[PDB]
Design a protein around this nucleic acid. Structure first.
Ligand code: DCT
Ligand code: MG
Ligand code: MG
Lengths: 363, 983, 357
DNA sequence: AAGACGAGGGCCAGTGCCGTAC
DNA sequence: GCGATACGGCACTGGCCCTCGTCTT
């Protein structure tokens, strides 16, 4: 409950003091900083990869923010439900099939009169009644698995089995914040009620081929708050006894980490073949890895200062270009997980970073 | 009714055989022992019409059964024996299918080698297995060579179809296939995977070698070491189970050459075709050597194992069958997933600890760390050789705007970047591991040029030796250590000296942080060495340890991890959770290779019982198949089954990951498996060997009376009576008893019972000393007990009396030693003589325990064989479909069908009764007790498991997945007779 | 006949009356189809990529949609102006700097009148008054070239100049349809009046350092439309044949693989293999091997050409022998054959070869 | 300029300890 | 005098051998 200063100093959040847990959990926050929206960006991308791309029968859906008939959408489930028939047509009535969409939703909140918005990643899984529960447990285990990685302590993420007011099964996902558990994702099994209500005339356009027979689809639904999730990983990244020596650093997963590497200039001052830093810069961004530029600086200070400055930004590696490297070709490298000086080659550094992220995606 | 336990039997009218003097001795013994408080609880007698006996006794019954079951196979074996051999072909045919080589080794294309019997050895390219690639089989008539469909270069898809070798003939006797480790070859037979069948049985020269001249593993160790006064006499009379060695033993010809390149396991399919002729030649050499070995073994085995029950038993014990489906694949995927997840978490935490501890290198502050000061802490920065010159120092050699006119200056900086890049490469040679990081961290990382490279410090463990000392607090002390043993634990004043001095140069050690850590610990060499915990300064020596081995690392001390001492830090419940994770993946870690690679052939809808298709299950585009366990018929000792995976298969525990492996063998629709576990065999065996030795009746022994007195159902067995002392129920007490029968060593039983009961050593010692009453007593200078009434004498010549050794009172170890004394067969009953390497004639022998265990476990295995042949006899005689066997020593399960399950269970009960009556008859009397005649638990359900009720870990919901339930049995099955017309 | 092949190929949402060009240009919808969504995501990705290469540093942000004081947003300027003083710390007040963001802004569309939505990409570039016009011309050229790169014809995109008393100089990027040139992007040069209205005072924070100089920065307003751009490239790709030749780096689905031999499990195994392999290297692949019938080849090719698929892959039975596979291009429609192992490298090299300016 | 000693890493079998079943 | 019959796993290690480096002729 004191890493907030690290979020203000290094903008993963707003510099406003009024950032209470209520203001963060309601979505009434003034907004996220560049590093924060980047972190959430990589988080949502990691969602999209491990939910939409690898798994077939799942297609993107674009739901509007409002209704043609003022209050906005509370959930982007219904907007996806409106796109059921056409998406049935592009799948040739082959269910199970799902529609996924990551969009901001607007929730009315009575602060004890306002309205708070928050980014939500939703997947609506149209699945036959015969295998509804199986897909529910499936998505439970898989979502919980997706959230239990990227974490330094996966024990904080939990799942709760719960029933509806009528009896419909469902599962909730929690993250153990320092003040208790908090809802981060919800999974429910909707017994084809809303689809039936949306199409009262001809229900024949709702029938989906289960295999040897066309059945009415049961509507599974999973909605994940990525703001509370980004905050969850934000808290999880930060460090707790008899360590005898402490350093301020948040350990975010290399995949979702906002800024991957940090390029600077050492020794210092050296003119004027420093345009090689530009080369390494464009080369790095060409491969799609985030690089912070340490060119125009006021420090000119202890290396511990910008090292801690980079550790507060969860920057994986710190590449240092010096005149000796200008001579031979071996720049410096300081890892975040293990603060240790290491020499390496340039293209070797590029491929090392690419292999680092790519393998980090793996086991 | 009567004689303290008997049932209505027609196994002999006479009979007593009273032995009034012997029963007076027994009664007096049991009175002074003393047990004369009978419960008088008569078990319900069963009146049923027994199956027809062939006379005169049940001995000739089982004998004629075993003979009529193994007669055709013996005929075929004899056909292999008198086989006159045609020479090997000058060249092997490169054609798919079988190739017959008859006159002058001509190539005759054949689909199936029609022969009564043949030797066999299949080949398989491991590079893309496990599909057969080559095979050679010789016959009493001619030669045969089978090539797989891998003769044409394609991009094959292996889903294990019916591609294994075809060997069986169609109807619209009969077969015998011998081979070294024949089960593996059987696994590559096309027609063996079918639900029904089969006539074809198998004979294993390896198992046969084990029966004739086998040796224990302890013997194997010092047998291969040949490269305890008379312990080297059996060295040349026996051999290891290797084909080359067993051939060098039984044939004794020139040494057969083995493939020096190991091409079938080391090479691809490419380099196999390049050396096809040679590999075929080697396979032929193998089947030839195996043929010879078999020829020389069969009569030897027939001599050493004269009773046909062993033969037919070994015949049926080699055709096991495990039916499975897609649920197998799902099981593999889910189990491997869970394993990878838990391992990911563990390695994540451990690599985190290994990352945050790497920071205290700067500056030299690692010496203060009371855990991390033994290792390297190296700082390397190498290297370079000079080529640039000369004589000038190379170590030292805010404007606001908006310019873009230099559009291509970016490609200038790019070109400069590449041109700078290409010049440095010839400076270094080979990429070494990261020198900037300490050595302990280097070793704890994967190599850069490794195909399986993972970021950060990988290879964390659990059970490594660096990481546990890296994080854990140590038994009310600070440092852990290792040298000959890790931190001591589990498995009249005494004093020792102290010493501190300075010389150099050696790694500095710190002893303050330890004492301060102890201070912080109690904030909530001597003294505190016995029961408390502390660490000294230097030494290093024992100074108060109980275990004589050590334990790196503490991996099964959860009760000693969840009770305060010991704990870890940092920190919290991370320790016990880490131990939990280790315990969860303990099984799958040491087995996943054996289960994932556990191949399985799927039979299409073309070749399966259509009556099963008629059954309301398909199921939803589901795949049905099976796998043959691949079991060596007889592995020491005594001729017990040996199988890499299924015999060491874990049970249904909600803790272990792949614990469902046992219950993944699901019966096909319309079919169901019915099995049973003997309760109990070896105990009642030792009991009978006792009472039959002492007198005629079964309850004329102190130990033998308690065995056949307890009932497991709502009651208390002998194991359960020892487990409620207390006492720990129930497997532990079983280990204590069976360990007591084969050598109840005082310290062994000590640390064992103390490990299981968790109390203090003195009271425990009292308990042992009380339980040590059973083995007592026993027998110039000597133990103060002989045949003389008193030991003291003066110049008394009695070297002729010091030849008798025997315990007294409760137990009957004297009989087991009596079978362990005979220099000839030692086979009761039946009845097979084992090992030219343990037969005391020309052996020291000093292998006593192995031979006592040999006796009792042999009785257990002959029990097994008897059960097999008995079950087979009334399964073919009556209409009981599904005769496929799946046996695990004590337990045995048959793959019956849903409409013939109760009659099959009835067949199991009859079998057990007849076998018990056999063991009773071989020693007398034919009469037998009540609570031992019939089975108590008969499992009847789809998948095979332990208890009828089954929970599990990975699938979490067992019945959640497509499953059923089990049924206890019982007494309700004793109403369905063996006749077809029931209910 | 282009609006109809976007309905049957799921670029747009299902409509029968609001399918007109006027309803498409209007924010009112009948939202978007999966193909159009992926096209927009790739377009936005290339947009964010063509501004991340821009030196020195431009920080991405996100603005609220409703009113902070209680309403929906029209432009994407105010939210970027609120985070100016904060990002000042991150740029260390050192030089002129910008803030880019992509968001769904709204606009009233005129019975009763409704509300329309548009996903626009904006870039607010704070730059000194003396070097604001030059940088505005710079962004003019860079944006025009940005639209030019993925364009099948550079003549279809145009750049107009304008000015007024409120904005000293501005530029507007138009696109020829050619049913009527339409607004695609606006590039204005607003003064500090916009920023001096939300922070008075004491305005001592606003002025950034500019070479040992304190000066309140002039505000450059970049505002592009990705929906109108999507439609632009859709009309730019439309060419008895009816094939949409979208840019390779822009095309939603770039490859599709089916089977030819009668429905066999092994074919599905191989196809699943190629599926996983192609998805492993970030290549969008349409699975038509499901399938279920695989009726004709010509109408299949027509479908995959109306979906702007770069290459169609056919896995026959010969592939299960020699590994050869039936490739088929879109821009040339050449029925080729190549080994299945060298397909990944080919597609990746082909996409990478489209990386040029 | 060629030859010889020395340091580092991979492949190998051997050993100690742990894990399961009966 | 004594747990017994197996079955495998991983962590660690001394040793053979190729490769690179580097001193030496
Ligand atoms: N640690 C062990 C376990 C078993 N056995 C032998 C003795 C009996 C035989 C069968 O094992 P169990 O069936 O487990 O023993 P049991 O007394 O027959 O148990 P139960 O009454 O349940 O059948 O294996 C053994 O020697 N040592
Ligand atoms: Mg038993
Ligand atoms: Mg048993």
């Amino acid at each position: 409950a004191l890493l907030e200063i690290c979020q203000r100093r290094h903008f993963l959040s707003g510099s406003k003091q009024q950032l209470s847990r209520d203001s963060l959990l309601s979505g009434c926050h003034p907004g996220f900083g560049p590093l924060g929206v980047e972190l959430r960006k990589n988080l949502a991308a990691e969602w999209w990869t491990s939910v939409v791309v690898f798994r077939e029968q799942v297609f993107p859906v674009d739901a509007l923010h409002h209704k043609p008939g003022g209050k906005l959408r509370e959930n982007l489930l219904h907007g996806a439900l409106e796109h059921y028939v056409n998406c049935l047509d592009l799948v040739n009535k082959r269910l199970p099939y799902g529609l996924a969409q990551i969009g901001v939703c607007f929730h009315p909140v009575f602060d004890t009169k306002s309205i708070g918005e928050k980014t939500e990643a939703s997947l609506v899984w149209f699945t036959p009644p015969r295998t509804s529960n199986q897909w529910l447990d499936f998505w439970l285990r898989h979502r919980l698995q997706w959230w239990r990685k990227f974490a330094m302590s996966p024990s904080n993420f939990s799942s709760s089995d719960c029933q509806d007011e009528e009896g419909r099964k469902g599962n909730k996902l929690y993250y153990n914040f320092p003040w208790g558990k908090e809802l981060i994702e919800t999974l429910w099994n909707l017994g084809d009620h809303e689809l039936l209500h949306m199409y009262p005339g001809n229900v024949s356009k709702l029938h989906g081929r289960d295999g040897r027979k066309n059945v009415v689809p049961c509507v599974l639904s999973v909605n994940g708050d990525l703001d509370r999730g980004m905050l969850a990983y934000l808290y999880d990244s930060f460090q707790t006894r008899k360590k005898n020596l402490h350093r301020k650093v948040l350990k975010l997963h290399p995949c979702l980490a906002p800024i991957k590497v940090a390029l600077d200039v050492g020794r210092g001052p050296t003119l004027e073949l420093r345009q090689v830093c530009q080369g390494l810069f464009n080369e790095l961004l060409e491969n799609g890895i985030s690089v912070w530029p340490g060119y125009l600086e006021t420090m000119q200070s202890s290396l511990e200062q910008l090292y801690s400055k980079y550790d507060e930004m969860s920057i994986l590696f710190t590449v240092l270009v010096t005149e000796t490297t200008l001579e031979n070709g071996l720049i410096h490298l300081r890892s975040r997980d293990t603060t240790m000086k290491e020499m390496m080659h340039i293209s070797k550094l590029k491929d090392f970073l690419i292999k680092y992220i790519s393998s980090a995606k793996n086991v | 009714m009567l004689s303290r336990g008997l049932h209505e039997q027609i196994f002999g009218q006479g009979g007593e055989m009273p032995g009034e003097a012997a029963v007076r001795r027994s009664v007096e013994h049991l009175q002074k022992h003393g047990l004369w408080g009978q419960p008088a609880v008569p078990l319900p007698d069963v009146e049923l019409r027994l199956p027809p006996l062939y006379g005169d006794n049940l001995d000739q019954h089982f004998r004629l059964l075993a003979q009529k079951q193994s007669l055709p196979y013996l005929e075929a074996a004899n056909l292999l024996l008198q086989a006159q051999l045609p020479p090997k072909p000058p060249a092997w045919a490169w054609a798919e299918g079988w190739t017959r080589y008859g006159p002058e080794g001509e190539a005759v294309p054949v689909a199936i080698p029609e022969e009564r019997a043949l030797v066999f050895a299949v080949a398989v390219c491991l590079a893309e297995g496990t599909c057969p690639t080559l095979a050679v089989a010789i016959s009493p008539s001619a030669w045969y060579s089978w090539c797989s469909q891998r003769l044409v270069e394609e991009r094959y898809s292996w889903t294990s179809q019916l591609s294994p070798a075809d060997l069986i003939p169609l109807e619209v006797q009969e077969q015998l296939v011998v081979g070294h480790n024949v089960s593996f070859d059987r696994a590559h037979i096309r027609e063996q995977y079918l639900i029904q069948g089969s006539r074809m049985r198998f004979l294993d020269t390896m198992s046969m070698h084990m029966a004739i001249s086998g040796l224990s593993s302890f013997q194997r160790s010092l047998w291969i070491a040949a490269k305890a006064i008379s312990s080297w006499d059996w060295l040349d009379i026996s051999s290891v189970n290797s084909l080359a060695e067993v051939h060098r033993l039984y044939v004794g010809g020139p040494p057969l050459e083995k493939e020096p390149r190991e091409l079938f396991v080391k090479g691809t399919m490419k380099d196999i075709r390049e050396n096809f002729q040679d590999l075929m030649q080697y396979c032929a050499q193998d089947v030839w050597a195996t043929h010879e070995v078999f020829q020389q073994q069969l009569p030897l085995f027939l001599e050493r194992c004269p009773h046909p029950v062993t033969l037919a038993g070994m015949l049926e014990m080699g055709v096991s069958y495990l039916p499975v489906n897609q649920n197998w694949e799902r099981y593999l995927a889910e189990a491997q997933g869970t394993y990878e997840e838990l391992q990911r978490e563990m390695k994540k935490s451990l690599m985190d600890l290994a990352n945050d501890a790497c920071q205290l290198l700067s500056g030299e502050r690692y010496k203060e760390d009371p855990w991390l000061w033994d290792l390297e802490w190296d700082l390397q920065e190498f290297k370079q050789k000079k080529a640039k010159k000369v004589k000038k120092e190379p170590a030292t050699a805010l404007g606001p705007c908006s310019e873009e006119e230099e559009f291509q200056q970016d490609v200038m900086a790019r070109a400069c970047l590449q041109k700078l890049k290409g010049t440095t490469e010839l400076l270094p040679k080979r990429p070494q591991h990261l020198p900037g990081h300490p050595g302990w961290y280097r070793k704890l990382c994967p190599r850069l040029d490794d195909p399986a490279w993972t970021p950060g410090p990988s290879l964390l463990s659990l059970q490594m030796r660096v990481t546990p000392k890296l994080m854990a607090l140590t038994w009310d002390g600070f440092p852990l250590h290792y040298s000959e043993r890790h931190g001591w634990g589990y498995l009249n004043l005494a004093k020792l000296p102290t010493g501190t001095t300075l010389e150099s140069a050696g790694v500095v050690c710190p002893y303050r942080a330890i004492e301060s850590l102890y201070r912080k610990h109690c904030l909530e060499p001597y003294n505190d060495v016995d029961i408390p915990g502390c660490w000294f300064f230097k030494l290093p020596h024992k100074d108060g340890n109980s275990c004589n081995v050590g334990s790196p690392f503490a991996k099964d001390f959860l009760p000693k991890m969840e009770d305060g001492t010991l704990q870890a830090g940092p920190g919290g419940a991370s320790g016990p959770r880490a131990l939990e994770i280790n315990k969860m993946i303990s099984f799958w870690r040491n087995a996943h290779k054996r289960i994932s690679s556990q191949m399985v052939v799927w039979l299409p809808r073309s070749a399966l019982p259509r009556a099963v298709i008629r059954h309301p299950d398909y199921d939803e585009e589901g795949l049905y198949g099976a796998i043959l366990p691949q079991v060596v018929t007889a592995g020491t000792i005594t001729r017990r089954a040996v199988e890499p995976t299924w015999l060491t298969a874990s049970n249904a525990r909600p803790d272990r990951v792949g614990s469902e492996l046992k219950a993944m063998v699901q019966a096909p629709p319309g079919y169901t498996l019915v099995g049973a576990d003997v309760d109990s065999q070896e105990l009642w065996i030792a009991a009978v060997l006792g009472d039959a030795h002492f007198a005629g009746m079964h309850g004329c022994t102190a130990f033998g009376w308690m065995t056949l007195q307890g009932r497991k159902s709502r009651g208390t067995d002998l194991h359960s009576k020892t487990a409620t002392t207390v006492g720990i129920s129930r497997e532990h007490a079983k280990i204590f008893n069976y360990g007591r029968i084969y050598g109840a060593g005082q310290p062994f039983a000590e640390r064992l019972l103390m490990q299981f009961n968790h109390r203090l050593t003195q009271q425990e010692a009292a308990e042992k000393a009380q339980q040590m009453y059973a083995a007592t007593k026993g027998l110039l200078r000597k133990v103060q007990r002989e045949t003389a009434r008193k030991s003291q004498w003066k110049k008394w010549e009695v070297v002729a009396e010091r030849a008798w050794k025997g315990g007294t009172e409760s137990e009957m170890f004297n009989k087991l030693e009596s079978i362990a004394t005979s220099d000839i067969p030692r086979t009761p009953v039946l009845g097979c003589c084992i090992s030219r390497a343990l037969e005391p004639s020309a052996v020291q022998e000093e292998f006593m325990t192995s031979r006592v265990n040999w006796v009792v476990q042999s009785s257990a295995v002959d029990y097994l064989h008897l059960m097999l042949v008995a079950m087979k006899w009334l399964f073919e005689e009556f209409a009981i479909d599904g005769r496929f066997c799946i046996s695990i020593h004590d337990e045995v399960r048959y793959l019956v069908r849903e409409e013939d399950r109760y009659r099959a269970a009835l067949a199991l009960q009859i079998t057990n009764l007849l076998t018990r009556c056999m063991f009773a008859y071989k020693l007398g009397l034919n009469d037998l007790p009540q609570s031992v005649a019939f089975f108590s638990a008969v499992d009847i359900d789809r998948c095979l498991r332990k208890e009828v009720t089954m929970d599990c870990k990975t699938p979490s919901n067992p019945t959640g997945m497509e499953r059923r339930y089990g049924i206890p049995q019982g007494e309700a099955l004793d109403i369905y007779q063996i006749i077809e017309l029931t209910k």
